[PDB]
Amino acid sequence: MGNVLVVIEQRENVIQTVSLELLGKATEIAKDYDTKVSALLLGSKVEGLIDTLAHYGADEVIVVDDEALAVYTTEPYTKAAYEAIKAADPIVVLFGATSIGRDLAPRVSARIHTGLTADCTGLAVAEDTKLLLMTRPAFGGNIMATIVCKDFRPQMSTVRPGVMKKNEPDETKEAVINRFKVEFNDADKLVQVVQVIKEAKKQVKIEDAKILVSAGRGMGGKENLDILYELAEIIGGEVSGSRATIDAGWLDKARQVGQTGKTVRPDLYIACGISGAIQHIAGMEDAEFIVAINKNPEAPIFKYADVGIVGDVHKVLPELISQLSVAKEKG
Amino acid sequence: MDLNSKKYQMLKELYVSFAENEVKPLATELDEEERFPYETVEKMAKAGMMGIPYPKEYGGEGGDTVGYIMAVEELSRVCGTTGVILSAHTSLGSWPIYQYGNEEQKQKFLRPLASGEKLGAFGLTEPNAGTDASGQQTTAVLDGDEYILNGSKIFITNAIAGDIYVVMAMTDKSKGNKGISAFIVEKGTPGFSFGVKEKKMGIRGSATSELIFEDCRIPKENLLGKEGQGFKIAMSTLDGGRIGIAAQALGLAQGALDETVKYVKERVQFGRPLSKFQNTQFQLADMEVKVQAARHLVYQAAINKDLGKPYGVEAAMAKLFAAETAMEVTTKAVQLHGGYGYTRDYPVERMMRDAKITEIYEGTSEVQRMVISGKLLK
Amino acid sequence: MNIVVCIKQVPDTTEVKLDPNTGTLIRDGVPSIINPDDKAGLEEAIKLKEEMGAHVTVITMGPPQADMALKEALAMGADRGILLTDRAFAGADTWATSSALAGALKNIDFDIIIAGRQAIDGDTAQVGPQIAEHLNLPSITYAEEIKTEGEYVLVKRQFEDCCHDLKVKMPCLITTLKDMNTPRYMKVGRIYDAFENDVVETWTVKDIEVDPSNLGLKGSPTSVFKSFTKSVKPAGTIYNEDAKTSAGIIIDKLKEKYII
Ligand SMILES: Cc1cc2nc3c(=O)[nH]c(=O)nc-3n(C[C@H](O)[C@H](O)[C@H](O)COP(=O)(O)OP(=O)(O)OC[C@H]3O[C@@H](n4cnc5c(N)ncnc54)[C@H](O)[C@@H]3O)c2cc1C
Ligand SMILES: Cc1cc2nc3c(=O)[nH]c(=O)nc-3n(C[C@H](O)[C@H](O)[C@H](O)COP(=O)(O)OP(=O)(O)OC[C@H]3O[C@@H](n4cnc5c(N)ncnc54)[C@H](O)[C@@H]3O)c2cc1C
Ligand SMILES: Cc1cc2nc3c(=O)[nH]c(=O)nc-3n(C[C@H](O)[C@H](O)[C@H](O)COP(=O)(O)OP(=O)(O)OC[C@H]3O[C@@H](n4cnc5c(N)ncnc54)[C@H](O)[C@@H]3O)c2cc1C
Ligand SMILES: CC(C)(COP(=O)(O)OP(=O)(O)OC[C@H]1O[C@@H](n2cnc3c(N)ncnc32)[C@H](O)[C@@H]1OP(=O)(O)O)[C@@H](O)C(=O)NCCC(=O)NCCSS
Ligand SMILES: [Ca+2]
Ligand SMILES: [Ca+2]
């Protein structure tokens, strides 16, 4: 047979979590094929990341240590993975659908002349035909299609981070280390990295924001919004609010949501202490997922919430912060 | 020829994106601060507008008046003051120089305008001479190789901001309106001074103010047309501008209608949205018919001008009927928003205040009636 | 200096909603537009036309309607337009698409090729680098700024955490990002003449250099097995306890995928 290969991503010598999730789905696909699971590790001084991979389900760890892989630049990575994948002959190759993954994979699958499915959210091999059914969301997300690579091998896909579930780390299992040598010459080093500068996360407008934590009259004061901005930090979204809060001097008009503020259609909306008049609801009714906290279970906002929590803002919010801050402390 | 051509479609696509992104989110800041939109003038110029229907050889874009009127319509749809800044610039200031100015003149004055590098204005109305236009009191007398100008023009759109002024004055009072001449006057000349920008009901962004001429010395080379032609020059200029304003009304009417349709669906009272009550529908119906009716009258005037058929009566029917239609529709619009319509957080009220002036300036609806009935009775 | 931009006319999938009272997605009303990453690229090219004196050519693969995309692009400042239409491409996946476009580029003088990161209707973000691979050109993605010095391009590459300042000797392919710039409006008169005179070239397969067994479905490795519409959102639950409450919040969040 072939093998199920996951292409690992590392950033300044730390494995990205989506890799370990992908080894998760990898052991399932491989078990459905009666083959084992392989890891492609790429980097400069990437020694020791290897034992980690072994623990998270990898059976073979293909290693390419070179100072040409020190920093990510498309071609050295493409050439390397091509050589290594072509050499292992996998039935299936998975990359994490990141800015590296979605740059590297399309170039690799072209050089191989196979097929590639992008930003996937679901994978499983059919009972009949034993093809990998790779399901991805398209058309701005309003469509869910399932694509197969009928004839060409390896079946390739970039997979969405956060969707596949990891394996239980096993400290006993070591894996086989493959120690794959690759030469890198001029016609590959064509892109030159002048500077690697890391800047901050770049504040965005609420109309464009991905998550909104939204202040209502319920909060009861300007400094009481700090607890929101605190939570806004832990999820990345910005804080918006009802005309109530803006009027009262707590936020810029630029954060007002509704018929005479801004109309916002983000992936998450948390209404903290908002009653929800139509003046406000017709501003955000079209969000993908709305969560609301209020003391009044007869608040009309609950009439719109996918999750209506009935409670005190100043007692739910800090409990939501403590539960999440231990969430990304541990994982 | 035909007006559903993809050419015009592509213009409309441009206008709409400029309107929503550059003009719409300034609208009420200009209403409340009662401020001229210098920014969206320079932005406007850059994307081609400000010279839409003038030959390229003079710095305009090579378009037709239909694509220009389309622009006034799509601007007033979102912000009425901005609509007039344009329509006044292209129709009232630029065009008389295009039509009646010689080659030297079309190069020194018409090009800065058509390229958006400068801003144009037309000054005809005086305190004692409004609808009776021939009772001009500002004088021009020729002295050497200069004209001297003395008097006042009130209510002039795009005063202070404007750079070139096409003003009218008597050069021979003892001939009535066969005694008015027209002059091109550059802002900066000694003696040319401004009023105080007026306080008005709705078009509050548009800078309207007084022109003051105290022994104002002008080059004789600035006489637009012949001596004594000015009356006919101003009369035919207004025929064009009436089209611009009719479309301004149209813009307003269509924007106010667009807003109510949005609202009447979101707002629920009595278990069902407002859009579900037979009266709100029937009112919306009557409004859309008046707007459509008006559309046809406006553009048939434009079409006429571009084909060089006569267009002055056509323009007057468009001015009368769109002005009325703007007023009825904006009013029904606020009504249909209910209490919220009357607040200034929503734009419908501003549209209603904007609308009212479209019955007055560039000739009052009564003047239009005089025109239409005159070509009918012989 | 020759710049070729690949724009794709797409239906604006932000403006797509699914009618709860029918179930399917709202069919009409969605305007067709230059996909925005593409408009962005087109912006960066015309910027270069204005600074360096470059020559912007624009090409789109699609049906006659995609003419309008090129006309929009032309009135924005482009110089040339190519509309590439053929029955052959029916069913093309991203391999059979990048190769089609690549084969055209064999006949379009270039020094920089610009495409968008992602087309908002297929959503793969795969054609740009596959084109660059077919033509065996260095490629740069997730581009946030583009400058040139002499024979070299300088590009900022945007990442999750860092961003690289890069340098390439022309030729090269660059995929550009929806933000990074704000795209200039058309000029009237540019619209008037782009329609009044009309220099827009329409190429068929005859005009490209490709193995025809690399076109269309028959040339496409991947293929669509099943495809089904988005499920309509469900009822929504309303809850009464505390601190079990935040767990209420976080376990439904874990369900819609933000396990971090
Ligand atoms: C012309 C006009 C335009 C308007 N435009 C807008 C607009 O664009 N956007 C907008 O938002 N509004 C707008 N409004 C106002 C809108 O109708 C409401 O006034 C608005 O919803 C008030 O904000 P709110 O829900 O936060 O406040 P309230 O409705 O006063 O609700 C506060 C809620 O907090 C709850 N509560 C209080 N303390 C707590 C606590 N400790 N824990 C839990 N729950 C608590 C209460 O039960 C109540 O439900 C407009 C009004 C007018 C007249
Ligand atoms: C905001 C604003 C901007 C303006 N901008 C300009 C500009 O840029 N350039 C410019 O030249 N002018 C401009 N004007 C002047 C405007 O065009 C005049 O107000 C208009 O021509 C009417 O003249 P009037 O104000 O003196 O009205 P009047 O002539 O005093 O008339 C008032 C009323 O009497 C009626 N009436 C008058 N005579 C008769 C009659 N014979 N028969 C029946 N009814 C009659 C009118 O129809 C009207 O209802 C502007 C005015 C305003 C308000
Ligand atoms: C529901 C669905 C799912 C699909 N899934 C896959 C899949 O998993 N794998 C796969 O290989 N194909 C897939 N396809 C096929 C793919 O959408 C088409 O081949 C399309 O031609 C390329 O994908 P894209 O539209 O995602 O473009 P992208 O790869 O997002 O676009 C990249 C860039 O290429 C340029 N470009 C793209 N198309 C054109 C064009 N027609 N003309 C000019 N320039 C262009 C633009 O600059 C664009 O920004 C799918 C199609 C559908 C309808
Ligand atoms: C123009 C003005 C000042 C008054 O003058 P005016 O309208 O030109 O009137 P006249 O030319 O003297 O009358 C024409 C006569 O010629 C007659 N006539 C035409 N042909 C003829 C012929 N072959 N043989 C004999 N008589 C003839 C007509 O019968 C008519 O007589 P009636 O009065 O019985 O109808 C005024 O009426 C006006 O319309 N002002 C408009 C201003 C405006 O729009 N201002 C807004 C600017 S603000 S931005
Ligand atoms: Ca190589
Ligand atoms: Ca200000």
Author numbering:
A (entry chain A): 1 to 331
B (entry chain C): 1 to 378
C (entry chain B): 6 to 265
From the paper:
The EtfAB/Bcd complex was found in a heterododecameric (EtfAB/Bcd)4 state with a molecular mass of ca. 440 kDa. Architecturally, the tetrameric Bcd forms the core of the enzyme complex to which four EtfAB units are peripherally attached. Each EtfAB unit forms two contact areas with a Bcd dimer (the monomers named Bcd1 and Bcd2) that are placed around 50 Å apart from each other. The first contact area is located between the N-terminal domain of Bcd1 and the EtfAB base and is considered as fixed during the reaction cycle. The second contact region is formed between domain II and the Bcd1–Bcd2 dimer. In the determined EtfAB/Bcd structure characterized by a pronounced domain II-Bcd dimer interface, the distance between α-FAD and δ-FAD is 8.4 Å thereby indicating that the EtfAB/Bcd complex is trapped in a dehydrogenase-conducting conformation termed D state. The edge-to-edge distance between the β-FAD and α-FAD isoalloxazines is 37 Å which certainly excludes mutual ET. In the D state, α-FAD is involved in the domain II-Bcd interface and the exposed xylene ring is completely encapsulated by T343, Y346, and Y340 of Bcd2 as well as F155 and E198 of Bcd1. Therefore, domain II is kept in its position by its interactions with Bcd.
